Symmetry: C3
């Protein structure tokens, strides 16, 4: 068991969780711009690719905060020890997207090897879920490289007890001397508030500004 | 009775109200940036705090327009003579937010005294609604001070006949020579359209640019 | 018959369509900024008005891509040969909006004549749908000229099998040496993905940068 059953009996956010879960079911999206000036430099002195490093960096930050790793399993509220990213891959020949995942690793070079192999194996597989069933301990990551956006938001009919963060990136752009990346974060309010989203974004920004390895 | 029953029989927006209320239930959110350069200067020559003045200023503008003060009471469509703001307060020890309100006043200094006392009284109260039942004649105001956003949007499951405006502020930032504040406005389309939201924002901007007292 | 019944039996996006249509009903909105510097120049050397040219230009691009012209008719998935725009008109005396449409034409001057006459005929008609029943082969276009927005999003209760794109424009603004127009695109995920929205926006931008006639 790769999760811990959360002591909700005793949880300080108990009232908050039930209000936003059942009283006023709510989630929100917010788009913010990440300075990736430093990151671009780091990439430049390396052989790492952009999409693969963002995946890694987002999964790395989601994995430092518990509230971004919450779920319901057995009608119980759990916390995943770790999450693996499910990212999108564009298929040029069909104009559709496939969703892929691979195991997260604190070792970036091991991450990269995991990524390239999943990519090699399923590159021509235009099914929606080429690997089958999505692992429950996941996060969704996606990228719209062709257009810059100031906003993005998913309008989903029903969102009951779906607590995995959905992260979307747009095309970066030169905003003077800075290179910025619009990143949309969408979460459920039962487990995550505005503070927790801000704390993830401040952490991701830190990481973009640090050495890769 | 602190409201007037609206003559809907005769209302020019009658068809519009029923279409967006029952035919195609709809609301929208929009985020715009308020120049608060002047405001910062005003604050600087004063002892007023930021969050408290924004609250006051938003409640002041919501209180000049009727359509932002609408509601259903008794299955009747009403207009509130006045509304009191319900703002959020962050509790650092629990990572949760409390919602508080206090009486609106055209006298800012009286507003401030109302604010500080409600704050003093409930500062350590991490309940969600420390004061109990929210007053019906309200508006929601909230602030995400830790992160700058270009967009924000609430995804609420059901929104039936909930006509109170929800306003969210982000961290301001220096956009050249200007200090700007992302402000998200979310409303129901039955009572408020794009014109009315724009008219509120143009009015709030005016007010940010004027003397406080 | 102004549509073709789509071979969905054989469609490469078959799985994608049913997943986002029934499994996880989903749509999204995204706001991007269109450089209309060139366009302003073109207008300047002409007698064309802004709202009318944007309408024309958006309808022109929607009409080059099939996926933006999809619908359900007879429980069948169709593609419209062509679509006519339904745009909004502000009535200053009532503070409400009317929705109007007129026939699309590859000849801009013919477009303009169609537009001016529909405008002349229904200018003082504050009904919501002054012309009656909206043509099925449409797109919605709207404009909020009074305020600049970085984001916009419609929160619609139910969106079942409604595949027509909704496009919203804000007030442009001078962003240094460029004049930019925030444009919000909202679509259903069953027929349109992030690639297809980006491809529409890249096409509209091209068109803004080209001669009118
Ligand atoms: Co419950
Ligand atoms: Co860990
Ligand atoms: Co009705
Ligand atoms: Co009054
Ligand atoms: Co089905
Ligand atoms: Co054609």
């Amino acid at each position: 068991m790769n999760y811990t059953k959360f002591d909700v009996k005793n949880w300080v956010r108990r009232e908050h969780f039930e209000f936003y879960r059942h009283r006023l079911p709510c989630g929100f999206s917010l788009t913010s711009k990440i300075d990736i000036t430093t990151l671009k430099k780091s990439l430049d002195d390396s052989a790492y690719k952009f999409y693969p490093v963002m995946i890694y960096l987002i999964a790395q930050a989601v994995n430092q905060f518990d509230e971004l790793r919450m779920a319901i399993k057995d009608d119980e509220l759990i916390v995943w020890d770790s999450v693996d990213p499910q990212f999108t891959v564009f298929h040029q020949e069909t104009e559709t997207f496939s969703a892929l995942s691979c195991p997260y690793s604190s070792d970036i070079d091991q991450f990269m090897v995991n990524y390239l192999s999943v990519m090699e194996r399923y590159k021509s597989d235009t099914k929606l879920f080429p690997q089958g069933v999505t692992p429950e301990n996941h996060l969704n990551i996606s990228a719209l490289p062709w257009v810059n956006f100031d906003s993005f938001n998913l309008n989903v009919a029903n969102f009951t007890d779906y607590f995995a963060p959905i992260i979307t990136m747009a095309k970066y752009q030169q905003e003077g001397d800075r290179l910025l990346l619009p990143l949309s974060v969408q979460v459920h309010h039962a487990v995550c508030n505005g503070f927790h989203v801000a704390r993830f974004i401040n952490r991701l920004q830190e990481l973009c500004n640090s050495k890769l390895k």
